[PDB]
PDB file of C-alpha atoms in Angstrom:
ATOM      1  CA  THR A 194    -121.599 -51.627 239.970  1.00  0.00           C
ATOM      2  CA  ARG A 195    -122.005 -54.930 238.163  1.00  0.00           C
ATOM      3  CA  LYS A 196    -122.547 -58.642 238.711  1.00  0.00           C
ATOM      4  CA  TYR A 197    -119.991 -61.263 237.696  1.00  0.00           C
ATOM      5  CA  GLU A 198    -120.635 -64.911 236.911  1.00  0.00           C
ATOM      6  CA  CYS A 199    -118.319 -65.821 239.797  1.00  0.00           C
ATOM      7  CA  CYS A 200    -120.577 -64.591 242.544  1.00  0.00           C
ATOM      8  CA  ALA A 201    -124.207 -63.735 243.209  1.00  0.00           C
ATOM      9  CA  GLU A 202    -123.548 -60.294 244.736  1.00  0.00           C
ATOM     10  CA  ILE A 203    -122.974 -56.859 243.234  1.00  0.00           C
ATOM     11  CA  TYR A 204    -119.328 -55.779 243.181  1.00  0.00           C
ATOM     12  CA  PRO A 205    -118.820 -52.002 242.879  1.00  0.00           C
ATOM     13  CA  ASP A 206    -115.883 -50.459 241.074  1.00  0.00           C
ATOM     14  CA  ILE A 207    -114.499 -47.028 240.237  1.00  0.00           C
ATOM     15  CA  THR A 208    -113.070 -46.573 236.746  1.00  0.00           C
ATOM     16  CA  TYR A 209    -110.766 -43.663 235.970  1.00  0.00           C
ATOM     17  CA  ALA A 210    -110.610 -42.473 232.358  1.00  0.00           C
ATOM     18  CA  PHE A 211    -107.391 -40.627 231.525  1.00  0.00           C
ATOM     19  CA  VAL A 212    -107.946 -38.689 228.303  1.00  0.00           C
ATOM     20  CA  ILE A 213    -104.445 -37.636 227.247  1.00  0.00           C
ATOM     21  CA  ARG A 214    -103.382 -35.604 224.220  1.00  0.00           C
ATOM     22  CA  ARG A 215    -100.011 -35.882 222.502  1.00  0.00           C
ATOM     23  CA  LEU A 216     -98.093 -32.739 221.610  1.00  0.00           C
ATOM     24  CA  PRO A 217     -97.634 -33.142 217.818  1.00  0.00           C
ATOM     25  CA  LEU A 218     -94.410 -31.195 217.283  1.00  0.00           C
ATOM     26  CA  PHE A 219     -91.735 -33.848 217.785  1.00  0.00           C
ATOM     27  CA  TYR A 220     -93.102 -36.433 215.365  1.00  0.00           C
ATOM     28  CA  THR A 221     -94.093 -33.641 212.981  1.00  0.00           C
ATOM     29  CA  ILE A 222     -90.539 -32.290 212.911  1.00  0.00           C
ATOM     30  CA  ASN A 223     -88.911 -35.728 212.835  1.00  0.00           C
ATOM     31  CA  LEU A 224     -91.308 -37.960 210.848  1.00  0.00           C
ATOM     32  CA  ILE A 225     -93.930 -35.942 208.966  1.00  0.00           C
ATOM     33  CA  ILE A 226     -91.802 -33.280 207.273  1.00  0.00           C
ATOM     34  CA  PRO A 227     -89.054 -35.749 206.239  1.00  0.00           C
ATOM     35  CA  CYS A 228     -91.811 -37.945 204.792  1.00  0.00           C
ATOM     36  CA  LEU A 229     -93.384 -35.053 202.876  1.00  0.00           C
ATOM     37  CA  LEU A 230     -90.062 -33.896 201.431  1.00  0.00           C
ATOM     38  CA  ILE A 231     -89.463 -37.313 199.873  1.00  0.00           C
ATOM     39  CA  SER A 232     -93.050 -37.408 198.600  1.00  0.00           C
ATOM     40  CA  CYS A 233     -92.357 -34.115 196.815  1.00  0.00           C
ATOM     41  CA  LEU A 234     -89.803 -35.925 194.627  1.00  0.00           C
ATOM     42  CA  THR A 235     -92.373 -38.505 193.506  1.00  0.00           C
ATOM     43  CA  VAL A 236     -93.372 -36.546 190.404  1.00  0.00           C
ATOM     44  CA  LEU A 237     -90.044 -35.021 189.321  1.00  0.00           C
ATOM     45  CA  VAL A 238     -89.067 -38.203 187.471  1.00  0.00           C
ATOM     46  CA  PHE A 239     -91.551 -37.225 184.756  1.00  0.00           C
ATOM     47  CA  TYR A 240     -89.853 -33.867 184.121  1.00  0.00           C
ATOM     48  CA  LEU A 241     -86.392 -35.443 183.902  1.00  0.00           C
ATOM     49  CA  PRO A 242     -85.100 -35.804 180.320  1.00  0.00           C
ATOM     50  CA  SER A 243     -84.422 -39.388 179.299  1.00  0.00           C
ATOM     51  CA  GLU A 244     -80.963 -38.562 177.923  1.00  0.00           C
ATOM     52  CA  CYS A 245     -79.816 -37.625 181.436  1.00  0.00           C
ATOM     53  CA  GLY A 246     -79.770 -41.310 182.367  1.00  0.00           C
ATOM     54  CA  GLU A 247     -80.828 -40.659 185.965  1.00  0.00           C
ATOM     55  CA  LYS A 248     -84.585 -41.295 185.840  1.00  0.00           C
ATOM     56  CA  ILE A 249     -84.380 -44.752 187.414  1.00  0.00           C
ATOM     57  CA  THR A 250     -81.976 -43.544 190.102  1.00  0.00           C
ATOM     58  CA  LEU A 251     -84.396 -40.830 191.222  1.00  0.00           C
ATOM     59  CA  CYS A 252     -87.554 -42.933 191.471  1.00  0.00           C
ATOM     60  CA  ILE A 253     -85.806 -45.998 192.911  1.00  0.00           C
ATOM     61  CA  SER A 254     -84.310 -43.845 195.668  1.00  0.00           C
ATOM     62  CA  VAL A 255     -87.727 -42.340 196.413  1.00  0.00           C
ATOM     63  CA  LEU A 256     -89.309 -45.794 196.663  1.00  0.00           C
ATOM     64  CA  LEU A 257     -86.624 -47.189 198.961  1.00  0.00           C
ATOM     65  CA  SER A 258     -86.920 -44.106 201.184  1.00  0.00           C
ATOM     66  CA  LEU A 259     -90.695 -44.289 201.591  1.00  0.00           C
ATOM     67  CA  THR A 260     -90.395 -48.000 202.354  1.00  0.00           C
ATOM     68  CA  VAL A 261     -87.942 -47.285 205.182  1.00  0.00           C
ATOM     69  CA  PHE A 262     -90.251 -44.651 206.670  1.00  0.00           C
ATOM     70  CA  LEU A 263     -93.172 -47.083 206.653  1.00  0.00           C
ATOM     71  CA  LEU A 264     -91.143 -49.624 208.627  1.00  0.00           C
ATOM     72  CA  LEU A 265     -90.031 -46.984 211.131  1.00  0.00           C
ATOM     73  CA  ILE A 266     -93.671 -46.074 211.752  1.00  0.00           C
ATOM     74  CA  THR A 267     -94.495 -49.785 211.920  1.00  0.00           C
ATOM     75  CA  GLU A 268     -92.265 -49.975 215.008  1.00  0.00           C
ATOM     76  CA  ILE A 269     -94.118 -47.158 216.820  1.00  0.00           C
ATOM     77  CA  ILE A 270     -97.809 -47.945 216.319  1.00  0.00           C
ATOM     78  CA  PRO A 271     -99.464 -51.034 217.832  1.00  0.00           C
ATOM     79  CA  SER A 272     -99.975 -54.088 215.656  1.00  0.00           C
ATOM     80  CA  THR A 273    -103.760 -53.830 216.078  1.00  0.00           C
ATOM     81  CA  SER A 274    -105.726 -54.597 212.911  1.00  0.00           C
ATOM     82  CA  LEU A 275    -108.884 -52.596 213.688  1.00  0.00           C
ATOM     83  CA  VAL A 276    -107.867 -49.179 212.325  1.00  0.00           C
ATOM     84  CA  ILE A 277    -105.052 -47.992 210.066  1.00  0.00           C
ATOM     85  CA  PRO A 278    -103.252 -44.682 210.742  1.00  0.00           C
ATOM     86  CA  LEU A 279    -103.739 -41.851 208.281  1.00  0.00           C
ATOM     87  CA  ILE A 280     -99.949 -41.597 208.077  1.00  0.00           C
ATOM     88  CA  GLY A 281     -99.749 -45.282 207.186  1.00  0.00           C
ATOM     89  CA  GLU A 282    -102.379 -44.909 204.472  1.00  0.00           C
ATOM     90  CA  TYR A 283    -100.632 -41.908 202.929  1.00  0.00           C
ATOM     91  CA  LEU A 284     -97.217 -43.582 202.894  1.00  0.00           C
ATOM     92  CA  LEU A 285     -98.620 -46.790 201.422  1.00  0.00           C
ATOM     93  CA  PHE A 286    -100.512 -45.033 198.636  1.00  0.00           C
ATOM     94  CA  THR A 287     -97.450 -42.972 197.737  1.00  0.00           C
ATOM     95  CA  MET A 288     -95.451 -46.207 197.618  1.00  0.00           C
ATOM     96  CA  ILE A 289     -97.996 -47.720 195.226  1.00  0.00           C
ATOM     97  CA  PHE A 290     -97.870 -44.656 192.976  1.00  0.00           C
ATOM     98  CA  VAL A 291     -94.076 -44.391 193.140  1.00  0.00           C
ATOM     99  CA  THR A 292     -93.967 -48.023 192.022  1.00  0.00           C
ATOM    100  CA  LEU A 293     -96.343 -47.124 189.193  1.00  0.00           C
ATOM    101  CA  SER A 294     -94.010 -44.299 188.174  1.00  0.00           C
ATOM    102  CA  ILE A 295     -91.089 -46.739 188.001  1.00  0.00           C
ATOM    103  CA  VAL A 296     -93.052 -49.018 185.678  1.00  0.00           C
ATOM    104  CA  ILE A 297     -94.081 -46.039 183.547  1.00  0.00           C
ATOM    105  CA  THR A 298     -90.551 -44.627 183.585  1.00  0.00           C
ATOM    106  CA  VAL A 299     -89.138 -47.960 182.412  1.00  0.00           C
ATOM    107  CA  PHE A 300     -91.650 -47.983 179.560  1.00  0.00           C
ATOM    108  CA  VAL A 301     -90.897 -44.350 178.680  1.00  0.00           C
ATOM    109  CA  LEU A 302     -87.169 -45.083 178.560  1.00  0.00           C
ATOM    110  CA  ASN A 303     -87.822 -47.957 176.158  1.00  0.00           C
ATOM    111  CA  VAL A 304     -89.803 -45.684 173.830  1.00  0.00           C
ATOM    112  CA  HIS A 305     -87.093 -43.017 173.822  1.00  0.00           C
ATOM    113  CA  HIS A 306     -84.387 -45.456 172.650  1.00  0.00           C
ATOM    114  CA  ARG A 307     -86.101 -46.699 169.473  1.00  0.00           C
ATOM    115  CA  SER A 308     -84.797 -46.242 165.932  1.00  0.00           C
ATOM    116  CA  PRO A 309     -85.863 -47.514 162.498  1.00  0.00           C
ATOM    117  CA  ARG A 310     -83.128 -50.161 162.642  1.00  0.00           C
ATOM    118  CA  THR A 311     -85.090 -51.946 165.397  1.00  0.00           C
ATOM    119  CA  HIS A 312     -88.725 -50.764 165.477  1.00  0.00           C
ATOM    120  CA  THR A 313     -91.280 -49.213 163.135  1.00  0.00           C
ATOM    121  CA  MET A 314     -93.476 -46.243 163.975  1.00  0.00           C
ATOM    122  CA  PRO A 315     -97.161 -47.120 163.451  1.00  0.00           C
ATOM    123  CA  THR A 316     -99.234 -44.659 161.474  1.00  0.00           C
ATOM    124  CA  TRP A 317    -101.605 -43.850 164.338  1.00  0.00           C
ATOM    125  CA  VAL A 318     -98.772 -43.125 166.784  1.00  0.00           C
ATOM    126  CA  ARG A 319     -97.552 -40.361 164.494  1.00  0.00           C
ATOM    127  CA  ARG A 320    -101.147 -39.126 164.334  1.00  0.00           C
ATOM    128  CA  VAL A 321    -101.898 -39.254 168.069  1.00  0.00           C
ATOM    129  CA  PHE A 322     -98.656 -38.628 169.956  1.00  0.00           C
ATOM    130  CA  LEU A 323     -97.185 -36.052 167.552  1.00  0.00           C
ATOM    131  CA  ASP A 324    -100.269 -34.102 166.393  1.00  0.00           C
ATOM    132  CA  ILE A 325    -103.214 -34.453 168.783  1.00  0.00           C
ATOM    133  CA  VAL A 326    -101.791 -34.937 172.278  1.00  0.00           C
ATOM    134  CA  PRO A 327     -99.030 -32.285 172.016  1.00  0.00           C
ATOM    135  CA  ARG A 328    -101.679 -29.721 171.076  1.00  0.00           C
ATOM    136  CA  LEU A 329    -103.701 -30.522 174.202  1.00  0.00           C
ATOM    137  CA  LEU A 330    -100.694 -30.367 176.539  1.00  0.00           C
ATOM    138  CA  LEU A 331     -99.778 -26.902 175.194  1.00  0.00           C
ATOM    139  CA  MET A 332     -96.358 -28.167 174.071  1.00  0.00           C
ATOM    140  CA  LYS A 333     -95.738 -27.162 170.452  1.00  0.00           C
ATOM    141  CA  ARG A 334     -93.135 -29.027 168.429  1.00  0.00           C
ATOM    142  CA  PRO A 335     -91.038 -26.597 166.347  1.00  0.00           C
ATOM    143  CA  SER A 336     -91.587 -27.097 162.622  1.00  0.00           C
ATOM    144  CA  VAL A 337     -88.303 -28.664 161.493  1.00  0.00           C
ATOM    145  CA  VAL A 338     -87.762 -30.975 158.511  1.00  0.00           C
ATOM    146  CA  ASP A 339     -84.787 -33.352 158.548  1.00  0.00           C
ATOM    147  CA  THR A 340     -83.624 -34.951 155.307  1.00  0.00           C
ATOM    148  CA  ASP A 341     -82.178 -37.987 157.080  1.00  0.00           C
ATOM    149  CA  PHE A 342     -84.644 -40.800 157.700  1.00  0.00           C
ATOM    150  CA  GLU A 343     -82.904 -42.488 160.651  1.00  0.00           C
ATOM    151  CA  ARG A 344     -82.441 -39.156 162.444  1.00  0.00           C
ATOM    152  CA  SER A 345     -85.997 -37.922 161.828  1.00  0.00           C
ATOM    153  CA  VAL A 346     -87.767 -41.103 162.933  1.00  0.00           C
ATOM    154  CA  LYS A 347     -85.190 -41.494 165.699  1.00  0.00           C
ATOM    155  CA  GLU A 348     -85.955 -37.940 166.812  1.00  0.00           C
ATOM    156  CA  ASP A 349     -89.691 -38.606 166.514  1.00  0.00           C
ATOM    157  CA  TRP A 350     -89.341 -41.503 168.951  1.00  0.00           C
ATOM    158  CA  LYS A 351     -87.645 -39.168 171.421  1.00  0.00           C
ATOM    159  CA  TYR A 352     -90.495 -36.667 171.144  1.00  0.00           C
ATOM    160  CA  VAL A 353     -93.069 -39.422 171.658  1.00  0.00           C
ATOM    161  CA  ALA A 354     -91.256 -40.264 174.890  1.00  0.00           C
ATOM    162  CA  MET A 355     -91.546 -36.650 176.059  1.00  0.00           C
ATOM    163  CA  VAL A 356     -95.263 -36.541 175.246  1.00  0.00           C
ATOM    164  CA  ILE A 357     -95.962 -39.706 177.237  1.00  0.00           C
ATOM    165  CA  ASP A 358     -93.847 -38.256 180.038  1.00  0.00           C
ATOM    166  CA  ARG A 359     -95.873 -35.037 180.026  1.00  0.00           C
ATOM    167  CA  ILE A 360     -99.198 -36.896 180.133  1.00  0.00           C
ATOM    168  CA  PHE A 361     -98.285 -38.557 183.425  1.00  0.00           C
ATOM    169  CA  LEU A 362     -96.651 -35.418 184.820  1.00  0.00           C
ATOM    170  CA  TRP A 363    -100.071 -33.766 184.604  1.00  0.00           C
ATOM    171  CA  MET A 364    -101.960 -36.870 185.727  1.00  0.00           C
ATOM    172  CA  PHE A 365     -99.754 -37.530 188.757  1.00  0.00           C
ATOM    173  CA  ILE A 366     -99.932 -33.913 189.926  1.00  0.00           C
ATOM    174  CA  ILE A 367    -103.730 -34.104 189.831  1.00  0.00           C
ATOM    175  CA  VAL A 368    -103.804 -37.501 191.548  1.00  0.00           C
ATOM    176  CA  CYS A 369    -101.181 -36.458 194.099  1.00  0.00           C
ATOM    177  CA  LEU A 370    -103.117 -33.318 195.030  1.00  0.00           C
ATOM    178  CA  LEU A 371    -106.550 -34.962 194.965  1.00  0.00           C
ATOM    179  CA  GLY A 372    -105.322 -37.862 197.082  1.00  0.00           C
ATOM    180  CA  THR A 373    -103.694 -35.629 199.686  1.00  0.00           C
ATOM    181  CA  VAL A 374    -106.609 -33.207 200.050  1.00  0.00           C
ATOM    182  CA  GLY A 375    -109.111 -36.044 199.652  1.00  0.00           C
ATOM    183  CA  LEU A 376    -107.491 -37.887 202.574  1.00  0.00           C
ATOM    184  CA  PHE A 377    -106.477 -35.309 205.200  1.00  0.00           C
ATOM    185  CA  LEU A 378    -109.167 -32.665 204.656  1.00  0.00           C
ATOM    186  CA  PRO A 379    -112.149 -34.843 205.730  1.00  0.00           C
ATOM    187  CA  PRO A 380    -110.677 -35.417 209.210  1.00  0.00           C
ATOM    188  CA  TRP A 381    -109.719 -31.780 209.759  1.00  0.00           C
ATOM    189  CA  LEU A 382    -113.328 -30.857 208.941  1.00  0.00           C
ATOM    190  CA  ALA A 383    -114.531 -33.190 211.712  1.00  0.00           C
TER     191      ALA A 383
ATOM    192  CA  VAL B 291     -81.341 -29.992 199.683  1.00  0.00           C
ATOM    193  CA  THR B 292     -84.808 -30.992 198.474  1.00  0.00           C
ATOM    194  CA  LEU B 293     -85.136 -27.568 196.868  1.00  0.00           C
ATOM    195  CA  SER B 294     -81.764 -28.154 195.206  1.00  0.00           C
ATOM    196  CA  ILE B 295     -83.000 -31.510 193.898  1.00  0.00           C
ATOM    197  CA  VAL B 296     -86.001 -29.780 192.321  1.00  0.00           C
ATOM    198  CA  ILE B 297     -83.797 -27.069 190.809  1.00  0.00           C
ATOM    199  CA  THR B 298     -81.354 -29.688 189.521  1.00  0.00           C
ATOM    200  CA  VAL B 299     -84.189 -31.575 187.831  1.00  0.00           C
ATOM    201  CA  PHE B 300     -85.245 -28.332 186.152  1.00  0.00           C
ATOM    202  CA  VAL B 301     -81.667 -27.515 185.112  1.00  0.00           C
ATOM    203  CA  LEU B 302     -81.168 -30.996 183.668  1.00  0.00           C
ATOM    204  CA  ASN B 303     -84.388 -30.556 181.706  1.00  0.00           C
ATOM    205  CA  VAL B 304     -83.184 -27.198 180.379  1.00  0.00           C
ATOM    206  CA  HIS B 305     -79.690 -28.408 179.467  1.00  0.00           C
ATOM    207  CA  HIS B 306     -81.033 -31.178 177.204  1.00  0.00           C
ATOM    208  CA  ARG B 307     -83.214 -28.942 175.012  1.00  0.00           C
ATOM    209  CA  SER B 308     -82.677 -28.664 171.262  1.00  0.00           C
ATOM    210  CA  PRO B 309     -84.435 -26.802 168.433  1.00  0.00           C
ATOM    211  CA  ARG B 310     -86.115 -30.056 167.388  1.00  0.00           C
ATOM    212  CA  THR B 311     -88.143 -30.119 170.631  1.00  0.00           C
ATOM    213  CA  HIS B 312     -88.117 -26.627 172.184  1.00  0.00           C
ATOM    214  CA  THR B 313     -87.827 -23.068 170.902  1.00  0.00           C
ATOM    215  CA  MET B 314     -85.788 -20.450 172.732  1.00  0.00           C
ATOM    216  CA  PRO B 315     -87.850 -17.365 173.647  1.00  0.00           C
ATOM    217  CA  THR B 316     -86.215 -14.042 172.882  1.00  0.00           C
ATOM    218  CA  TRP B 317     -86.473 -12.926 176.512  1.00  0.00           C
ATOM    219  CA  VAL B 318     -84.699 -16.071 177.738  1.00  0.00           C
ATOM    220  CA  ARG B 319     -81.909 -15.461 175.236  1.00  0.00           C
ATOM    221  CA  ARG B 320     -81.557 -11.795 176.173  1.00  0.00           C
ATOM    222  CA  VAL B 321     -81.594 -12.282 179.941  1.00  0.00           C
ATOM    223  CA  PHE B 322     -79.609 -15.482 180.390  1.00  0.00           C
ATOM    224  CA  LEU B 323     -77.014 -14.774 177.681  1.00  0.00           C
ATOM    225  CA  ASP B 324     -76.416 -11.028 178.170  1.00  0.00           C
ATOM    226  CA  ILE B 325     -77.363  -9.780 181.634  1.00  0.00           C
ATOM    227  CA  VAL B 326     -76.959 -12.583 184.172  1.00  0.00           C
ATOM    228  CA  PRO B 327     -73.660 -13.937 182.753  1.00  0.00           C
ATOM    229  CA  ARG B 328     -72.137 -10.462 183.034  1.00  0.00           C
ATOM    230  CA  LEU B 329     -73.226 -10.034 186.658  1.00  0.00           C
ATOM    231  CA  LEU B 330     -71.914 -13.463 187.672  1.00  0.00           C
ATOM    232  CA  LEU B 331     -68.523 -12.595 186.127  1.00  0.00           C
ATOM    233  CA  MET B 332     -68.790 -15.552 183.728  1.00  0.00           C
ATOM    234  CA  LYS B 333     -67.857 -14.614 180.161  1.00  0.00           C
ATOM    235  CA  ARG B 334     -68.952 -16.659 177.167  1.00  0.00           C
ATOM    236  CA  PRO B 335     -66.416 -16.934 174.323  1.00  0.00           C
ATOM    237  CA  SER B 336     -67.154 -14.953 171.163  1.00  0.00           C
ATOM    238  CA  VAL B 337     -67.489 -17.803 168.663  1.00  0.00           C
ATOM    239  CA  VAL B 338     -69.829 -18.133 165.681  1.00  0.00           C
TER     240      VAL B 338
END
């Protein structure tokens, strides 16, 4: 019962509250799993050798797929701006990181294609990316000496590209796992 | 198909390995150049 500004009397009412629960097997089969499968390909670009010439194709395709899925979800959920779905957050953050991988992959490709005829290896790069970092990442460069100068520095540039690739392969796996568990585990544990 | 994409990434990584970057373990050599090729009826040519 409540009083309205219209009238000076009490007007009773009966409110029915329908608490309904959705069965989460259709949208899990048709939206969630297809979204996860594409997210699994987010990190593979960092294990792809640069000589293959398919790095950009892989990450670009992943980005344009996640973008499509976000729009499909955008057409299901209401346009309310009070709360953001957990699915929307996860897709958006993956899109941001996939974009970051593209920028990194472009930079890595540039490093791989350097030779003495165009660039010069700084002293500290040879110290850091060929001696220190490879030791940490448990990747050991075989001890080979090449007489040629433009095939030894050219090969060194290629190895530097692999090392930078391996740094982000480890970093993204950690971030990808921490983000996923750090996002969907809190809710499950009410 | 996603599993095949992962496996193809791994195979591409393996195919582009050279002594200047990776070293071939003896077990990899043994297995993948003696046993598995024989079972799959694929014969490598005897060249040196």
